[PDB]
Amino acid sequence: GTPVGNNKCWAIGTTCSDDCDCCPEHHCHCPAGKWLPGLFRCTCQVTESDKVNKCPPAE
């Protein structure tokens, strides 16, 4: 009944810790801030593009 592969699937919007931490369909967005240096950490967000989590899928 809905088995769990390797991807642990962290909290959406939080920082990733690799090791299949985030979900496969999602990725780790590492944006930045303008006006002088001071960009915040990365956040986990869904991804549809060809570039997804290095980890395998999970159904």
From Swiss-Prot:
Tissue-wise expression: Expressed by the venom gland.
Domain Oxytoxin-type inhibitor cystine knot (ICK) positions: 6-59
Subcellular localization(s) per the UniProt record: Secreted
Highest taxon in the source lineage: Eukaryota
Disulfide bond annotation, renumbered to this chain: 9-23, 16-28, 20-55, 22-44, 30-42
Domain notes: The presence of a 'disulfide through disulfide knot' structurally defines this protein as a knottin.
Family note: Belongs to the spiderine family. Cationic/spiderine subfamily.
Function per UniProt: Has antimicrobial, insecticidal, cytolytic and cytotoxic activity. Active against E.coli DH5alpha, E.faecalis VKM B 871, B.subtilis VKM B 501, A.globiformis VKM Ac 1112, P.aeruginosa PAO1 and S.aureus 209P in submicromolar or low micromolar ranges. Lyses human erythrocytes. Kills HeLA and A549 cells.
Protein name: Spiderine-1a
Organism: Oxyopes takobius
Lineage of origin: Eukaryota, Metazoa, Ecdysozoa, Arthropoda, Chelicerata
